[PDB]
């Protein structure tokens, strides 16, 4: 799940209790990640680990 306030991921310190992950269904992580890879590496090779 990404960009979904319905199932927003949590990542905060037990003592803090204040979630550090603030997502908005307006953003698009999925696509963002894609383009990112095509700019740092050769998006033609394959890598099973990350499928």
């Amino acid at each position: 799940y990404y960009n979904s306030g319905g199932n927003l991921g949590v990542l905060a310190g037990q003592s803090s209790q204040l979630n550090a992950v603030v997502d908005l269904q307006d953003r698009n992580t999925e696509l963002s990640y894609q383009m990112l890879l095509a700019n740092t590496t050769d998006r033609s090779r394959y890598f099973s680990m990350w499928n």
Binding site: S4, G5, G6, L8, N19, V22, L24, Q25, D26
Partner: protein
């Protein structure tokens, strides 16, 4: 105007509030309200869900928990300290609970 029945717009005989799914409010076309991750679904007010999934439905109906809470607070300020049938004097014909029937 070819009608002579009750006019909900005047006498207040509404009866189509059970036909709403969700409502989304946003300021400056970006800042969603109330935001701040207040509701289980911070991006909107789901009045009712069709597919249970998690089961955000309460009162043994199809009404979400978030909506039920909101209605209770806006009408009887009840919700932050247990859900109970509010006092009679506050339950008028135009109240929520008074007309809620699952």
């Amino acid at each position: 105007f070819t009608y002579s029945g009750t006019i909900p717009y005047l006498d207040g005989t509404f009866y189509l509030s059970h036909t709403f799914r969700k409502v989304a409010i946003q300021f400056d076309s970006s800042v969603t309200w109330p935001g701040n991750d207040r509701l289980l679904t911070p991006n909107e007010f789901e009045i009712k869900i069709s597919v249970d999934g998690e089961g955000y439905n309460v009162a043994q109906s199809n009404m979400t928990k978030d909506w039920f809470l909101v209605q209770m607070l806006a009408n009887y300020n009840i919700g932050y300290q247990g859900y109970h049938l509010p006092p009679d004097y506050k339950d008028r014909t135009f109240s929520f609970l008074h007309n809620f029937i699952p």
